[PDB]
């Protein structure tokens, strides 16, 4: 995921356009010695296991919201002016993803709960269409 940070400081809108195409492309004998020397092998295993756990937690979270298999996914939850009173022209222009992330860092749990409730309603509707 290293190359993703190349979009840092891109006014978000440009960053969004850049990710639309680039994110998909970005996602797609001596070394064994230290694996048996002291505790270096254990530290490497902890690093690899933790990386797997974080990847799977993010994929699970996307699955819960009904966004699995997508890179950019629209939901049915409306935006609340309480979370941010900036217009979409400011959020998507003259604002970076780091600034936005800080701007709503304390509303993440509210949005996540709303996404979970929205998916419960959708899944129900799918069951009802049958």
């Amino acid at each position: 995921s290293f190359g993703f940070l190349g979009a840092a400081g891109s006014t978000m809108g440009a960053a969004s356009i850049t990710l639309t195409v680039q994110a998909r492309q970005l996602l797609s004998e001596c070394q064994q010695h230290l694996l048996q020397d002291g505790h270096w092998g254990i530290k490497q295993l902890q690093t690899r296991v933790l990386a797997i756990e974080h990847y799977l937690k993010d994929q699970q979270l996307l699955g819960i919201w009904g966004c699995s298999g997508k890179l950019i996914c629209c939901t049915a939850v409306p935006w609340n002016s309480s979370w941010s009173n900036k217009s979409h022209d400011e959020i998507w222009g003259n604002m970076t993803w780091m600034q936005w992330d800080r701007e709503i860092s304390n509303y993440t749990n509210t949005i996540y709960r709303l996404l979970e409730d929205s998916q419960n309603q959708q899944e129900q509707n799918e069951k009802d269409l049958l």
Partner: protein
């Protein structure tokens, strides 16, 4: 209008992790740092990105400290122990170095051998009063504190450049702002996968190798007005210091157990001479004039006095370094003897029994090398301690983190957070 979830968002958070060591494609630093590094490595400059860096409280330094100690101990572990040599030594004058005889063990448990060896006075502790004539009884230093392990003669600790690399999911941010101090925002930040090559050089007062400042001389301290913090000075020009041990040593070896070879200095072919270093005088003088000027800027309306360190244990008052495996303790009092508004010869002592990393016990014995020893170093920085109208700055150090911090001051490790949420005009429908 509507919430949209994005994956792959270029957002990161400060995080701690474990970095792996890699090097450019025996030497303990080459046995370890197994992963080859890329030639011409990638650096991606982040435009219009400001980030907060802190040279202190940088977990990369604590990791490097732990990794250096762990590697050192693992390298010495499979080596000859010198416990059998804690015997009474009978020492006489050769004509700082004494001719000591002792009854050493052999491969047979019912046989001992008479061994004559030369030892430095700093490695010998008296048991009784020292006579000028006849002989006196002494013992090896640290014998009453711990076992002494002989460094393996076929394993070298000579530092080579190493690179610390992030595991996948993490990235290293480098501050590219010249004349940047610690604890503060950096307005020119680039993202790298690995650090530049860092040499794990061990020294106590001068930083004998490493990167030079791209700009002017930079004075960095966690709290410059606090007189208990160590000030790290990064020079923009190096000063050449040439160190030597002018002693034509003849090295002998004996077995002290099955497969256990002990190496010691057998004789000196020529005259016995004191080891010394020669540092260029004009470069040193310009260096201290420039350092004094910057300190005066940091400490206005004060005279800057560079003095020798206060008396104390040799390990904390002298400039210590490893020159081809030999441990030099140079008395740099002639170098810090000046006030701000061809060679300088520094006498040096040599020790064979080294207590590393400020630990008690786990002493290491450094075998001697035959012939004379020379090495040349590029002094790149200074470790100064303020005493707290005249300010006094003295050489100081011994907390090894400050040497490694002097190289890692520009790197930060961050974690990538690929998820984010933003409003859109498009409903899921």
């Amino acid at each position: 209008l509507w919430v949209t979830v994005y994956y792959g968002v270029p957002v990161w958070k400060d995080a701690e992790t474990t970095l792996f060591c890699a090097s450019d494609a025996r030497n303990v630093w080459a046995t370890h740092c197994c992963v080859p590094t890329d030639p011409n490595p990638q650096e991606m400059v982040l435009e219009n990105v400001t980030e907060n860096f802190n040279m202190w409280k940088n977990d990369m330094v604590e990791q490097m400290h732990e990794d250096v100690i762990s590697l050192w101990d693992q390298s010495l572990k499979p080596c000859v122990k010198l416990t059998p040599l804690c015997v009474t030594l009978e020492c006489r004058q050769v004509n700082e170095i004494k001719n000591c005889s002792f009854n050493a063990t052999t491969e047979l448990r019912d046989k001992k051998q008479k061994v004559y060896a030369l030892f430095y006075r700093l490695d010998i502790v008296p048991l009784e009063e020292e006579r000028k004539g006849n002989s006196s009884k002494y013992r090896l230093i640290n014998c009453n504190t711990s076992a002494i392990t002989q460094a393996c003669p076929k394993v070298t600790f000579d530092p080579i450049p190493i690179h610390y690399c992030a595991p996948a999911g993490y990235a290293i941010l480098k501050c590219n702002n010249k004349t940047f101090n610690g604890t503060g925002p950096c307005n020119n930040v680039s993202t790298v996968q690995c650090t530049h090559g860092i040499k794990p050089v061990v020294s106590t007062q001068l930083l004998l190798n490493g990167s030079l400042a791209e700009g002017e001389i930079i004075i960095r301290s966690e709290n410059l007005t606090n007189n208990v913090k160590t000030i790290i000075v990064h020079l923009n020009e190096s000063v050449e210091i040439v160190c030597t041990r002018p002693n034509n040593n003849t090295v002998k070896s004996i077995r002290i157990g099955p497969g256990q070879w002990f190496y010691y200095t057998g004789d000196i072919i020529g005259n016995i001479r004191q080891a010394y270093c020669n540092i260029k005088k004009d470069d040193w003088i310009r260096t201290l004039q420039r350092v004094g000027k910057k300190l005066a800027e940091h400490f206005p309306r004060r005279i800057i006095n560079f003095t020798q360190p206060a008396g104390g244990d040799l390990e904390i008052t002298t400039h210590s370094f490893n020159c081809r495996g030999e441990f030099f303790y140079c008395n740099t009092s002639s170098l810090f003897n000046s006030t701000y508004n061809l060679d300088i010869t520094i006498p040096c002592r040599i020790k064979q029994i080294i207590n590393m990393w400020q630990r008690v016990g786990q002493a290491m014995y450094a075998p001697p090398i035959e012939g004379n020893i020379t090495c040349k170093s590029n002094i790149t920085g200074l470790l100064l301690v303020r005493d707290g109208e005249t300010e006094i700055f003295r050489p100081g150090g011994g907390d090894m983190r400050n040497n490694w911090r002097s190289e890692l001051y520009k790197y930060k490790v961050v974690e990538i957070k690929p998820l984010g949420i933003a409003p859109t005009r498009c409903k899921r429908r």
